Assembly symmetry: D2
Homo-oligomer: 328 residues x 4
């Protein structure tokens, strides 16, 4: 069964890419409209983004807690910019407050040098090694270990957590991107590798280069893929939807459009097609070892109902369950 995730557009949303035409204001009330739509439709979770152009994701995720019952929140976590101890207490609180629905996604991100804006100036090599030190402590702190640590970048003493998360050993850990050295910090520490939506070929390959660097540390790793979606009644209708999405400003693979990448942000590619054809490329990707799909659409409210109504009926989607209350 597949784990279908939607997305919280906390950087902004709308009907058209590249322009304020058809724009859609984003506030907690709209963000809650999407999270609840997702909770209601069967999505396992929702990816909540990171970056200084986005409302803070921990806050956004935690404010959706009393209003959803089974949706999980995939909060993007930038190692380098925060203490691993703090990050382990926040992660613990998120998991507890939501009763086991916290999920974390490690991010380091190359461009821009936004790190500077946040008092971080490590080299591409230093951030990737600090990231590795960060999540080692984090992984250890979330397992009840009192941690004394002082490597190149991270330095803590008697680091201990008074209250544990609920998921075990710790809330799952996801890692996106590709790079090269990136894949390593993952193969050695994360539970699932997130990859941009590329043609099956380039993707089958990255699954190997990843699965291998993981096996070398004798560990199993999962895969998810981040795609944009533009599904409709018919392909005719879907290509038109796609063109119009770009109309205020590419099929690099069967029903794979980089039209969405024609702008400085997002999922670069989108599965454009009718119901059975998008289902087809989706499964195809699942045949390659992808068990999770982080989809998206503009606008995200209406589009989550489309992928949920046109796609889900044609897929073996993993339907999440509301967890029972922890006994008092």
């Amino acid at each position: 069964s597949l784990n279908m995730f939607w997305f919280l557009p906390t950087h902004g949303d709308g009907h058209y890419l590249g322009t304020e035409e058809g724009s859609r204001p984003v506030d907690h009330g709209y963000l809650q409209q999407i999270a609840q739509a997702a909770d209601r439709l069967g999505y396992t979770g929702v990816l909540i983004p990171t970056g200084r152009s986005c409302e803070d994701a921990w806050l956004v995720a935690a404010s959706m807690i009393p209003v959803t019952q089974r949706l999980k929140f995939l909060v993007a976590l930038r190692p380098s910019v925060t203490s691993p101890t703090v990050a382990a207490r926040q992660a613990a609180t998120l998991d507890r407050l939501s009763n086991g629905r916290a999920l974390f996604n490690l991010v380091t991100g190359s461009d821009p040098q936004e790190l500077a804006g946040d008092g971080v100036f490590l080299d591409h090599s230093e951030r990737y090694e600090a990231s590795a030190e960060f999540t080692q402590v984090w992984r250890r702190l979330l397992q009840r270990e009192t941690v004394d640590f002082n490597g190149k970048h991270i330095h803590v003493r008697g680091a201990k957590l008074l209250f544990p998360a609920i998921q075990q050993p710790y809330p799952p850990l996801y890692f996106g991107g590709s790079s090269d050295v990136a894949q390593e910090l993952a193969a050695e520490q994360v539970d699932l590798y997130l990859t941009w939506g590329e043609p099956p070929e380039l993707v089958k390959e990255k699954i190997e280069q990843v699965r291998a660097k993981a096996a070398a540390h004798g560990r199993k790793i999962r895969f998810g893929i981040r795609l944009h979606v533009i599904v409709r009644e018919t392909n005719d209708e879907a290509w038109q939807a796609a063109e119009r999405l770009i109309s205020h400003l590419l099929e690099i693979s069967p029903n794979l459009w980089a039209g969405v990448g024609l702008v400085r942000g997002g999922a670069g590619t989108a599965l454009v097609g009718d119901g059975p054809t998008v289902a087809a490329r989706i499964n195809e990707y699942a045949a390659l070892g992808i068990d999770s799909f982080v989809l998206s659409g503009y606008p995200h409210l209406e589009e989550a109902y489309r992928v949920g109504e046109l796609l889900f009926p044609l897929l073996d989607v993993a339907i999440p369950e509301i967890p029972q209350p922890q006994p008092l």
Copy 2:
């Protein structure tokens, strides 16, 4: 009018101090019970504490957003472990998602080996040093400025917020500290000075200083007092309740009990008496020039009802109002 605040006991709650007896489990559902209590009884806001013994305050606070309409959240802000930038982004996000209901509280940090846990190893001098840098950058950042600042502790380059907070010039900033270096930082940068409950005299003097040290900097500051409360219908039942509270393990001033201080839990003093009395002492404090009172009790849900039913009626309370949604 007086601004009455309550407390979210994110560290734990119960009817007894120092033992697991009569304890009460704290979780999202019980914190919401109190938050929602506070919102309806008319408390202006609610203070949410900081420390390794506490669920993370930002998350806890953000989680009460969709479920309270007027209540404000006094959240702890830590100048050392977090970049002033992120902290500026979080403050803004919190303020926007709640539509203007965020307030911050500066916590410089103490001992023993706790800060060592978050990887911050600085001297009592250096921390108050880092705080001033920190809040100078945070305040500036929340005012749409771009920042390049390199002091003894804070190094930020090109730091700027893409999205603005709602309140101007920024979400109020509260601060405490009997320390000498502290009242200074407060008189210069903070909006409200927060002091523990103490006999009228000892507090007059603390208010005397600060109000002067502030004016010298060409500004008017505000004062609030953190008292634990134990009101009842008679003084006899009050003392009885006070005595009961400790029963499993002091009156430094007319109906001002230090009993609550026996254990390193919560505030140190507590008004203890019937209504008209506690009101009266509340009014003395008011007279000094204190417009805000951050009360608390055990257990914190039943007590919020106690202070809202026996005390509010005898006081001139500022009724918080629900902010109209921002225009779309």
Copy 3:
């Protein structure tokens, strides 16, 4: 300023009229998605329908109470089938629980003889006279009057309300339809007359025949109109939307389609056009004395965001306010 209402499709919803293709399941979670969309977008209220094919409207309306803050609920009330006393206690509770957001719409309805299914067999003449007796008691009970009454159809003794509604003299009363004798029960007792969306002509006339029968009792009466809406970027796009809405099975006035009436239920007509043109026919109707507009669309979630994003910016819409809490 205009009072814009949306609609809660408690009989079912979807993308296409007359067929289960594109259908959309309706539950409390979806019904809450629409109510909240409406609360968030600026709609004064939402019309919640009556009939044995619909989830009970009082229940649906009351279950949206803790989740909305300013939306009003227009609950359809069929006089003949329930006691006026009960109906006055339920109306009182709805208004109190929502803090003044209850609105009631009187309905009698001709076809079908569904009344039978509910133990009601009065003649067309008997229901219209029982309706009149019903709301006379209702109007009186909601004004604190102890009521002794026994006419043809209604009979009560010592009828009194222990708790009053909040709106005064009573929650507003709306009346739909047309008929002839119908207009009378309205002109003599209701606050606003609801009329099906007909061309400006036939509508200007009904406003008179109504305004007159009201003036005869020396009272003022308001008007609202119930239309379906199909608004888009351009008229080209909107006519296509319209055709496709019917595609699984008429412009009786400029941009007025009875296509939607091509099925056994709904608003018979729909304003089909781009933004400025729908705005135009809307104002036109307002020029005639319509101060309230009950709009609708398929699906109702997505369509409420369309009318809210394409239409509202072009109209002088009355933006509702969240009412402050009744003081304790």
Copy 4:
């Protein structure tokens, strides 16, 4: 396991009986405080009363839906003033909107001149007559049947539900009545018999009868007892609390106080004692064959916490669970 229920004091609440002193205002926000209390403490359901002194139970109940996840609602059903059909539609809507959490309680009605208020003028014989007709039609209607029934009071033709309830064969039906005609109606049509708290003996006998009068009709019925509770840590504090409760205006059996009956408010008896004692008496009752206990207290929020913290631990409580959302 025992099924513990609580009470929504829609008529009023406070710490004292018979006077406005120590009173507490009841509104949606406080009822939700208790409903939400009940949901988290593990009470199976909550009883919401009927009468002119009460906010309407259906509305009150429906309003707690989006905010509770497992708690059930015991709502009053009135056979005389409402058609059995509507009542069938409402029951179904309530059951569906809450996803299977509705339970009904039959109330036949008493004196004095109250029914006269709702336009129902029938004799003590005729009302129990109308009840049986009523619930026979309601039960049949909730089982997808079409109905034509003309008895001494209920006249229905072609009555049928377009949408089904969730629970089968229908939402449980509870009933009370010491009356002779009552235990009969109960043994034949109801799911659970509800009796006031009485000394073990007097209740054994009532249970003896009913269990027989039911089997004769070829069916197993269930029993529940409506007790007011006053548990504390010692019996002394209990009696003290019991005495305090009346202080502004009796032990018919070991720790079974009739004091709560001095005023026509709530139930007539009340268990009064420390934990292990009250548990014990709860267990006696259990033994008789009572699986459900509908408790209450003053004020009803603080008390639900009292009974859930001092009593539950000493009992074998049936932990309600959250129902998984119906498949889409």
